[PDB]
Ligand binder design. Structure first.
Ligand code: CA
Ligand code: FE2
Ligand code: FE2
Ligand code: FE
Ligand code: FE
Lengths: 126, 125
């Protein structure tokens, strides 16, 4: 049963969606259950995938990760998301760009998430 | 589906937003999820079309020209601001004012809002 903020992927066609409103029905695509992309579950280099959160004037800077993650055509961070109270800010990225995002927001406690097309969903919090 | 589209299961109420497009049809409760196209539901536009106000360092968005209800069974579930490759979402709840403030640097933006009863709505500057 889907819950707000969960990210699901169809392993067949590649559709990836985020839940805005939950419910009882299971998400399906290409004749199979969409996969719940649970954070920090994939066996990949943590130093390149776990977001690093830096407090800045008026907000936060998030970089993926402690060591810059590749931003190649076949391997890159597709987006970085910042979660704070009832806010969900997303910055989509492209190969060639730096694996980082800046968010102007007033929130003491935040959760940063990032998604690698190959290595999945990752998160960190301050 | 395409990035940013919002789909709803008319049977159980699941609503999702596309982060990565693909060719497959999203399904829930044995039927294709419905694409919630903006400004298509027959509803009072003065209460659903987002009104974008430019402020120093960002934008203030209100739904709508006339404040939309924010009751337990009829309210604006979220307001979203689309700018460049950014998608900022502010979830709301009954009792709150149907408005949101986004600090961002962008001359052109698209504001969207979703009413649990009247669907998806948008406006731009
Ligand atoms: Ca979002
Ligand atoms: Fe990776
Ligand atoms: Fe409404
Ligand atoms: Fe359903
Ligand atoms: Fe699919």
């Amino acid at each position: 049963m889907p819950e707000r903020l969960q990210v699901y992927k169809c392993e067949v066609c590649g559709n990836i969606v985020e839940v805005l409103n939950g419910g009882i029905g299971e998400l399906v695509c290409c004749n199979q259950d969409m996969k719940l992309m649970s954070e920090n579950t994939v066996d990949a280099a943590k130093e390149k995938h776990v977001p690093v959160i830096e407090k800045i004037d008026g907000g936060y800077k998030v970089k993926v990760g402690a060591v810059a993650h590749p931003m190649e055509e076949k391997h890159y961070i597709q987006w970085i998301e910042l979660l704070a109270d009832d806010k969900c800010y997303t910055q989509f990225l492209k190969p060639g760009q730096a694996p980082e995002a800046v968010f102007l927001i007033e929130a003491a406690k935040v959760v940063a998430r990032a998604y690698c097309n190959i290595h999945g969903h990752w998160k960190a919090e301050n």
